[PDB]
């Protein structure tokens, strides 16, 4: 059961630095090359850096675009690989994925990625407003509740319900950027006989501000 | 660097039918050792991309034979037979014969029977007023196809400005879409009106699904 | 050079 999880993402001003971390499990870490690949809406997926084995004296290789600014390293004892990013530029914005260089000849296992944003703008934690069934007659799949997330930067924000215990019927629209801020809504549909009886809460996470906003929708 | 061009960009496919995704490289991917390191991946919404096929035609761990890869010179093809709801997502190719590069991806869409949206409307929360704005939200849930129109009427008059329309990714279970139309007015602008109505017009009917409330 | 463990 191979597992790969990255972290350290966030917002950084141009010319700043930040170090990304990746921890793996489910395999002998030291026997594999590790890679960092990034994804941006303008270049798609792009290989960034690679680090090989101890027997290779931990040889590293970098994409020409990050040469001299990024440094990849690993700590086999902690099954982790790192990416030190310096002299960051707007073009470095993207989702950074940590991947295992597989024995089959392809990067075989990937993490979910950690987002990095290089911008002159500043971080702004999201404001969250309740979306409450607005006094009406029951004519639309028991009851649909939600949370409106606005005024945040950078992206992303992830939204869970009841800490992730409520996943069925969850609908989260993509974020949209306007007036310098992102916004989105997440809604969930549940049986009308279970609300308010059963607590419904949305968990809004915003990595850039290191926050998790927990809010319980009630039916006033 | 090797350029991998994938086509189509978007690929609508009926359940049970076959989908063919192509990947064309700017140079031969045949390594001197006789192997061709061309691979295929699937990335579902928010999930980590997963390896499907490695070295042109080998299926990776847990991958069914429904997924098949082939190649001829600089052209490679991924074929997904008996497509199922859970197959939605972005498929992309990559090569590791030369410095690693990736294709732009192909978004596989599941073509299902048309479905009319369920509409819900939400007045702004008093909690948002001190921000200076007030957002009225109209949620259209579980419909297909994706295209749909939302008309807002304030006190009977159509209002087009101040509206943001955004969709969810296709649902992996029922293959439907959902979307929200958010009308954001200034706090005072919102208070200068009573009736807020949203009208959703979808392919499924010539008559709009209407929802509204009075402040 | 080689860019994957299999070729390596």
All structural domains of chain B: 1-112 (2.60.40.10), 114-213 (2.60.40.10)
Contacting residues for A202 by C-beta, under 8 A, at least 6 apart: A128, A146, A147, A159, A160, A161, A186, A188, A214, A215, A217
How far apart are alpha carbons A163 and A143 in whole angstroms? Answer: 19
Beta strands at B106-111 and B10-14: parallel, antiparallel or unpaired = parallel
Q: Does C7 touch chain A (CB under 8 A)?
A: yes
List phi, psi (to 5°) of A124.
-135, 115
Which pair of tokens denotes residue B190?
Answer: 């919102």
Q: Does B162 touch chain A (CB under 8 A)?
A: no
- Rounded to a whole number, what is the distance in Å from the CA of A28 to chain C's nearest CA? 15
Query: CB burial class (10 A; 0-12, 13-18, 19+) of residue B99?
Result: middle
Q: Which domains does chain A have, with CATH numbers?
A: 1-120 (2.60.40.10), 121-219 (2.60.40.10)
Cβ-defined contact of B48 to A44 (cutoff 8 Å): no
Cβ-defined contact of A33 to C6 (cutoff 8 Å): no
Cβ-defined contact of C4 to A32 (cutoff 8 Å): no
How far apart are alpha carbons A111 and A39 in whole angstroms? Answer: 13
DSSP type of residue B208: P
List phi, psi (to 5°) of B167.
-110, 160
Q: How far is CA A76 from CA A21, A51, A112, B180, in A?
A: 13, 12, 21, 47
Contacting residues for B19 by C-beta, under 8 A, at least 6 apart: B11, B13, B79, B80, B83, B87, B108
DSSP assignments along A160-218, one per residue? EEGGGTB-TTEEEPPPEEETTEEEEEEEEEE-GGGTTTS--EEEEEEGGGTEEEEEE--
Cβ-defined contact of A174 to B102 (cutoff 8 Å): no
Q: How far is CA A5 from CA A116, A162, A194, B45, C5, in A?
A: 15, 23, 36, 17, 21
CA A198, A168, B45, B178 torsion-angle sign:
negative
List phi, psi (to 5°) of A55.
-65, -15
CA angle B123, A165, B164 (to 5 degrees): 30
Is the CB of residue A136 less than 8 Å from the CB of residue B90? no
Residue with tokens 């960009």: B9
Approach to solving: X-ray
How far apart are alpha carbons C6 and B77 in whole angstroms? Answer: 22
Resolution in units of Å: 1.8
CA B6, B7, B9, B13 torsion-angle sign:
negative
DSSP assignments along B7-69, one per residue? E-SEEEEETTS-EEEEEEESS--B-TTS-B-EEEEEE-TTSPPEEEEETTTEE-TT--TTEEE
The set of chains that have 3 or more CB pairs under 8 A with C is A, B
Q: Distance from CA of residue B199 to its chain's centroid?
A: 23
Q: Does C5 touch chain A (CB under 8 A)?
A: yes
How far apart are alpha carbons B172 and A161 in whole angstroms? Answer: 18
Query: CB burial class (10 A; 0-12, 13-18, 19+) of residue A193?
Result: exposed
Kind and range of the H or E run holding B190: helix B187-191
- Rounded to a whole number, what is the distance in Å from the CA of C3 to chain B's nearest CA? 6
DSSP type of residue B162: T
How far apart are alpha carbons B203 and A123 in whole angstroms? Answer: 41
**b/e per residue B36-69 (b: at least 16 CB within 10 A):** bbbbbbbbeeeebbbbbbbbbbebbeebeeebbb
- Rounded to a whole number, what is the distance in Å from the CA of A140 to chain C's nearest CA? 53
Cβ-defined contact of C3 to B35 (cutoff 8 Å): no
Residue with tokens 């045949």: B30
Q: Does A102 touch chain C (CB under 8 A)?
A: yes
């Amino acid at each position: 059961e191979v597992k790969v999880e990255e972290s350290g993402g966030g917002l950084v001003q141009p010319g700043g630095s930040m170090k990304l971390s990746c921890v793996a499990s489910g395999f002998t870490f030291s026997n594999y090359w590790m890679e960092w690949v990034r994804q941006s809406p303008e270049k798609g997926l792009e290989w960034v850096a690679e680090i090989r084995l101890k027997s290779n004296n931990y040889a590293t290789h970098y994409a020409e675009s990050v040469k001299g600014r990024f440094t990849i390293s690993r700590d086999d004892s902690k099954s982790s690989v790192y990416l030190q990013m310096n002299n960051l530029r707007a073009e470095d914005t993207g989702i950074y994925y940590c991947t295992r260089g597989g024995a089959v000849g392809a990067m075989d296992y990937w993490g979910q990625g950690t987002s990095v944003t290089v911008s002159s703008a500043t971080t702004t934690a999201p404001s969250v407003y309740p979306l409450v069934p607005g006094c009406s007659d029951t004519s639309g799949s028991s009851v649909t509740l939600g949370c409106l997330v606005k005024g945040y930067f950078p992206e992303p924000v992830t939204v869970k319900w009841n800490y992730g215990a409520l996943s069925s019927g969850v609908r989260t629209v993509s974020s949209v950027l306007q007036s310098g801020f992102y916004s989105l809504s997440s809604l969930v549909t549940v049986p009308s006989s279970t609300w308010p009886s059963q607590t419904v809460i949305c968990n809004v996470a915003h990595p850039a501000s290191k926050v998790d906003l927990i809010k319980e929708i009630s039916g006033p | 660097d090797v350029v991998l061009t994938q086509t189509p960009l978007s690929l609508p496919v009926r359940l049970g039918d076959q989908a063919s995704i192509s990947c064309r490289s700017s140079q031969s991917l045949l390594h001197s050792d006789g192997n061709t390191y061309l691979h295929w991946y699937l990335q579902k919404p928010g999930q980590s991309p997963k390896l499907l096929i490695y070295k042109v035609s080998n299926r990776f761990s847990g991958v069914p034979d429904r997924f098949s890869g082939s190649g001829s010179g600089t052209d490679f093809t991924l074929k997904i037979s008996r497509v199922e709801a859970e197959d939605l997502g972005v498929y992309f190719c990559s090569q590791t014969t030369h410095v690693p590069t990736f294709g732009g991806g192909t978004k596989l869409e599941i073509k299902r029977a048309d479905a009319a949206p369920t509409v819900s409307i939400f007045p702004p929360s008093s909690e948002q007023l001190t921000s200076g704005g007030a957002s009225v939200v109209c949620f259209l849930n579980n419909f297909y196809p994706k295209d749909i129109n939302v008309k807002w009427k304030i006190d009977g008059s159509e209002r087009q400005n101040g509206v943001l329309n955004s969709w969810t990714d296709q649902d992996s279970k029922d293959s439907t879409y959902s979307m929200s139309s958010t009308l954001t007015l200034t706090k005072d602008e919102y208070e200068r009106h009573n009736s807020y109505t949203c009208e959703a017009t979808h392919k499924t009917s010539t008559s709009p699904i209407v929802k509204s409330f009075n402040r | 050079m080689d860019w994957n463990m299999h070729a390596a």
